[PDB]
Amino acid sequence: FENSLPKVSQSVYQMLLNEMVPLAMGIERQISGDIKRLKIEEHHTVDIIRSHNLIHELYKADEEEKEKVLARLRNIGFQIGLKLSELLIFSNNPNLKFKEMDLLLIMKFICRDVWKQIFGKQIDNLKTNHRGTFYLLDYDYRPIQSFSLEEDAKNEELKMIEPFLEIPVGIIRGVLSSLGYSSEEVICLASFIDRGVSFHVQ
Amino acid sequence: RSLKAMGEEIWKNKTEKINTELFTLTYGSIVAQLCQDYERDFNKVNDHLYSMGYNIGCRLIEDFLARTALPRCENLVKTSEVLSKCAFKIFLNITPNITNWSHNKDTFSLILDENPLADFVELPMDAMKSLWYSNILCGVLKGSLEMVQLDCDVWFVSDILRGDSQTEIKVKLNRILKDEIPIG
Amino acid sequence: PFESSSKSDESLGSIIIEGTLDKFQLHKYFFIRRLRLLKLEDQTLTAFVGAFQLIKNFIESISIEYRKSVRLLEFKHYFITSMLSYFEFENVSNPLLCEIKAELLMLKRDNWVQGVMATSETVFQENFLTLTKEILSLFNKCEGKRQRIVDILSIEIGLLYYQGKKYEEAVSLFLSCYEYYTQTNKNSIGLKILQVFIDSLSHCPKLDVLQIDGESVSASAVLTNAFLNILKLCKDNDSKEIWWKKFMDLQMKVHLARANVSAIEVNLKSYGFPEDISTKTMRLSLKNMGGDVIVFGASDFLLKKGENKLILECRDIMYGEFSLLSFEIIVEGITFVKEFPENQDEFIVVPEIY
Amino acid sequence: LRPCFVSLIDESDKPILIYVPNEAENEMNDVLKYNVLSNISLDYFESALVEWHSLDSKPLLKSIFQLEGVSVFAMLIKQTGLKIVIGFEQKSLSGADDEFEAINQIFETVRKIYIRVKCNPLLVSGDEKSIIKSLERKFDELFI
């Protein structure tokens, strides 16, 4: 039961997870279709922006370009979600067969194993409306503990945190479409009760 | 006490997780993004990977120095010691080897044994001759060393995925940065 | 009692198998243990079929036991151990699962008989195999499911029809079934079914086509042969496609509409020429050796259509053919509003609208 | 112990790959007599003669039928809806029980190379030819 098979650090993955978002902003704002910096390579030059200025460029982003960004985040979460679910297949969980007729039985899979694998802990609560709408909860979403809010400007800080939520949107969308189809699935906020984010699915 | 002993020692108080099934396919998924968004360009992807690598190396050097408190390096003996004997030990659970320095010891190479960034990838035929895969590592080894007051330049020579020769990275001191003291 | 008999029978069979010697007489002890298991499972709806599986694995294991060519005659004894077991499974009028069990038993008996007969009545062998395959096909068709084995059984029966000279071809007449095994998924089965249909059309010598629809045509062979040329392996069998295109040219019967997936044409930049602008030179690739057609690449304006750039003579016989495609009568005084609505149809007495 | 054909079937009627060992010489090899068993194997998943019970978490192995001197084995892996079929003849079979675990080793070591091939990041999403080509070079690495 206790498998001690090879491993790396959590911190470098968590910070790579965090810099997937300005990677997406950099790949959209620089599509190369015809203040910044400059670097020296051998007979070669690159020109970069830094991350927090690019999140501030998301604060000054166009509205249609903002949703053009957010498709890419759920696309990359979708890819890593379906491939990570495909590796979970090796685990041989006995809950499910295919097409998820009993939808909460694989909600008892994702909270038990997938969120344990990505974020080191279970999803602490799940509430069930029986029309397919299921109410996620976790008190502390793991890759936003390191995001420091500024001094008394939390209305900007909400708007600069919640575009980091499209990656687990991609995770749960990818593990659903590894098991057959696409249905609607959104985010929430759910201000926590004792000293983070909620999710809806069909 | 030794830099082998510290780098192995941090693995008793470091939070860990699986190196397959996460963290390989993160890099694979973002390089799939860069391949599909540039319509399979093979050299601009190296530039954007090196840019994101520079940013993550400049952000990672502080966690490396706060994890083990070490003095500022000055030559390519202490950097070639500290890299291969604790840095890839505590960030990737691996250890490379050092060879092919010059007569003035102003370079070395960075032969890597088990790269956990590319485990069973086997890149296709067109990308095999005009693409470097692990450019996030060359970005890290630029951006980390550029903040301990050394200008540097770190480049791949060959890797296992396209070539019979091993995975190695070449590197030049390219001078020592001068710390700016006065007011003006 | 039943579970204790099963567990004790398995343990006693292993304990009797712990003794090494007298393996030839141990067949009788295994048959006695099988009879003891069969007496316990005398009244079971589905588990008796599982007891048939307890037969069948033992019928595997006895097939693992005897290893000789003359033991094929002992497999004939296993045919008796099928047939008496068929007598142990004939105690039903009609049922869902018993029909499939009888189908599996008849398939095992037919496979054993075909293994025995092929070791060395030759005309009557086809009639007896067709009778047994017709019985097994009726038994498999008498079910709520299992259309996949029934289609392969009907294909085997039609191949047995083709195993003698027959003008009446059920598989070739079932071009719906040929497209069911050819349109997608199936290929190697389709590449033999289309070869059988083309050989039956070669030995047809008739012009009375299929009466299941309005498809009365002597170019139905060419319609199937387009799919046979698309599903061909390589240019090693290109003579079959060339001969079928030659037969379609000789027997022309000109109305057709092909998807033209066997040909690949790519365009280039628009230009001009002397007294009529010869825009849109295009390079084309093909599998057939000889092809001449008036290929015109249409183009749609905002409310018009040029439909220009046709060449009457085409001796090109290579990939990237680089057709000039001279385009007289430029519409809208050579405006730039015309987008692409390219038919690119290359009519060579039959239209291929890609 | 070596097989005579392998087969991978997804959740539809499609085959991902029908690979036989030794395509390079003819040697009286009929791909036709292999595809008919693969076509009826997807039929005999739904048959009530065999059943894959789901109480054990580990996916299990069965012995569906035996035709033309060839025995086939079909291990439905439950969750992703992939159907796999490997075939062996009687001359390769020894009839023992120790070989059954080695057969399950062959089944899991082709499932491992399937999940390693389809989790290549650089392949474009969709049923390419490159998944088939990568699968056959890995199989020819496994089977000379």
For residue B120, give how far its alpha carbon lies from the nearest alpha carbon of chain D (Å).
Answer: 7
Side chain identity, residue A78: F
Across-strand partners of B112? Answer: B167
CATH class of the D5-142 domain in this structure: alpha beta
- Distance, in Å, from the CA atom of C246 to the CA atom of C243, rounded to the nearest integer, reads 5
Query: What are the φ and ψ backbone dihedral angles of A135, each rounded to 5 degrees?
Result: -110, 105
- Inform me whether the C-beta atom of residue D49 falls under 8 Å from chain C C-beta atoms: yes
Query: What are the φ and ψ backbone dihedral angles of D22, each rounded to 5 degrees?
Result: 60, 70
Chain A partners within 8 Å of D121 (Cβ): 79, 83
Subunits close to A (at least 3 CB pairs below 8 A)? B, D
- Inform me whether the C-beta atom of residue D42 falls under 8 Å from chain C C-beta atoms: yes
Q: What is the DSSP string of C283-309?
A: EEE-SSS-----EE---B-SS-B----
- Distance, in Å, from the CA atom of D13 to the CA atom of C183, rounded to the nearest integer, reads 12
Q: Are strands D5-9 and D15-19 parallel, antiparallel or unpaired?
A: antiparallel
Instruction: Tell me which residue of A135, A132, A136, A133 sits closest to A101, measured CA to CA.
Output: A132
Q: For testing the chain A interface, which of B8, B13, B16 should be mutated: the one with the most A CBs within 10 Å?
A: B16
- Distance, in Å, from the CA atom of A81 to the CA atom of A114, rounded to the nearest integer, reads 9
Task: Note every long-range contact of B3-9, with CB atoms under 8 Å and residues 24 or more positions apart, other chains counting.
Answer: B3/B81, B3/B82, B3/B85, B3/B86, B4/B85, B4/B86, B6/B68, B6/B86, B7/B68, B7/B85, B7/B86, B7/B87, B7/B89, B7/B90, B8/B89
Instruction: Tell me which residue of B130, B154, B83 sits closest to A40, measured CA to CA.
Output: B154
- Distance, in Å, from the CA atom of B85 to the CA atom of B102, rounded to the nearest integer, reads 21
Chain C partners within 8 Å of D65 (Cβ): 104, 107
Distances (CA, A) of A24 to A66, A145, A168: 11, 21, 15
Chain C partners within 8 Å of D35 (Cβ): 186-189
Across-strand partners of B18? Answer: A7
CB-count exposure of residue C66 (10 Å: 0-12, 13-18, 19+) = middle
CB-CB under 8 Å, C148 with D40: yes
- What SS3 string covers B117-135? CCCCCCCCCCCCCCCCCCH
User: How many Cβ atoms are within 10 Å of D103's Cβ, its own excluded?
Assistant: 17
Structure tokens at C33: 């243990």
- Inform me whether the C-beta atom of residue D130 falls under 8 Å from chain B C-beta atoms: yes
Of C49, C64, C151, the CB nearest to D95: C64
Structure tokens at A166: 């499209």
Task: Give the three-state DSSP class for C141.
Answer: helix
Query: What are the φ and ψ backbone dihedral angles of D72, each rounded to 5 degrees?
Result: -120, 155
CB-CB under 8 Å, A94 with D57: yes
B1-184: what fold? Muramoyl-pentapeptide Carboxypeptidase; domain 2 (3.30.1380)
- Distance, in Å, from the CA atom of A168 to the CA atom of A199, rounded to the nearest integer, reads 9
Distances (CA, A) of D55 to B20, C12, D58, D59: 29, 28, 9, 10
Of D14, D15, D93, the CB nearest to C64: D93
CB B74 within 8 A of CB B149: no
For residue B56, give how far its alpha carbon lies from the nearest alpha carbon of chain D (Å).
Answer: 22
CB A180 within 8 A of CB A85: no
Element (H, E) at B155: strand B153-158
Cβ pairs bridging C and D (under 8 Å)? 65
Instruction: Specify the experimental method.
Output: cryo-EM
> Residue ranges of the alpha helices (H) in C233-352?
238-250
Query: What are the φ and ψ backbone dihedral angles of A11, each rounded to 5 degrees?
Result: -70, -40
Please identify among residues 25-64 of chain C the ones whose CB lies closer than 8 Å to any CB of chain D. Answer: 46, 49-50, 52-53, 57, 60-61, 63-64
Across-strand partners of A197? Answer: A138
User: How many Cβ atoms are within 10 Å of B79's Cβ, its own excluded?
Assistant: 21
Side chain identity, residue C323: S
Chain D partners within 8 Å of B31 (Cβ): 121-122
Between CA A115 and CA A69, with CA A190 as vertex, the angle to 5 degrees is: 70
- Distance, in Å, from the CA atom of C4 to the CA atom of C22, rounded to the nearest integer, reads 27
CB D59 within 8 A of CB A92: yes
Distances (CA, A) of C313 to C213, C292, C295, C326, C329: 38, 6, 10, 12, 19
Task: Give the three-state DSSP class for B68.
Answer: coil
Report domain extents, chain D: 5-142
Task: Give the three-state DSSP class for B66.
Answer: helix
Instruction: Tell me which residue of D27, D22, D25 sits closest to D6, measured CA to CA.
Output: D22
Side chain identity, residue C268: L
User: How many Cβ atoms are within 10 Å of B182's Cβ, its own excluded?
Assistant: 4
The answer, yes or no, to whether D and C have at least 3 beta-carbon pairs within 8 Å is: yes
Element (H, E) at B18: strand B16-18
> What is the distance of C-alpha A95 from the center of its chain?
25
Report domain extents, chain B: 1-184
Instruction: Tell me which residue of C182, C169, C185, C263 sits closest to C223, measured CA to CA.
Output: C182
For residue B134, give how far its alpha carbon lies from the nearest alpha carbon of chain D (Å).
Answer: 14
CB C200 within 8 A of CB C210: no
Subunits close to C (at least 3 CB pairs below 8 A)? D
Q: Which strands make up the sheet holding D70-74, listed edge to edge?
A: D15-19, D5-9, D83-89, D70-74, D66-67
Question: Closest residue of D to C64, CA-based?
Answer: D95
For residue A155, give how far its alpha carbon lies from the nearest alpha carbon of chain D (Å).
Answer: 38
Q: Give the E-state strand segments of chain C in sequence order.
A: 264-267, 282-285, 295-296, 310-311
For residue B61, give how far its alpha carbon lies from the nearest alpha carbon of chain A (Å).
Answer: 11
For residue C347, give how far its alpha carbon lies from the nearest alpha carbon of chain D (Å).
Answer: 31
Side chain identity, residue A199: F
For residue C4, give how far its alpha carbon lies from the nearest alpha carbon of chain D (Å).
Answer: 21
Instruction: Tell me which residue of C112, C143, C231, C114 sits closest to C182, measured CA to CA.
Output: C231
Of C61, C111, C152, the CB nearest to D95: C61
Distances (CA, A) of D10 to A106, D14, D50, D114: 21, 6, 20, 12
Q: What is the DSSP string of chain A?
A: ------EEEHHHHHHHHHTHHHHHHHHHH---------EEETTEEE----HHHHHHHHHT--HHHHHHHHHHHHHHHHHHHHHHHHHHGGG--SS--SS-SSHHHHHHHIIIIIHHHHHSS---EEEE-TTS-EEEEBSS-GGGSS----TT-HHHHHHHHGGGSHHHHHHHHHHHHTTT-----EE-----S---B-EEE-
Q: Are strands C282-285 and C264-267 parallel, antiparallel or unpaired?
A: antiparallel
The residue with tokens 């960004």 is: A69
Query: What are the φ and ψ backbone dihedral angles of A126, each rounded to 5 degrees?
Result: -140, 125
CB C100 within 8 A of CB D47: yes
Across-strand partners of D71? Answer: D66, D88
Largest CA distance in chain B: 56
- Distance, in Å, from the CA atom of C104 to the CA atom of B89, rounded to the nearest integer, reads 61
CB-CB under 8 Å, D119 with B124: no
Chain B partners within 8 Å of D124 (Cβ): 36
Chain B partners within 8 Å of D122 (Cβ): 28, 31-32, 35, 121, 123-124, 127
Sequence-ordered list of residues with C-beta below 8 angstroms from that of B110, at least 6 positions apart, any chain = B83, B84, B96, B98, B168, B169, B170, B171
CB-count exposure of residue C141 (10 Å: 0-12, 13-18, 19+) = middle
Of B59, B60, B93, the CB nearest to A8: B93
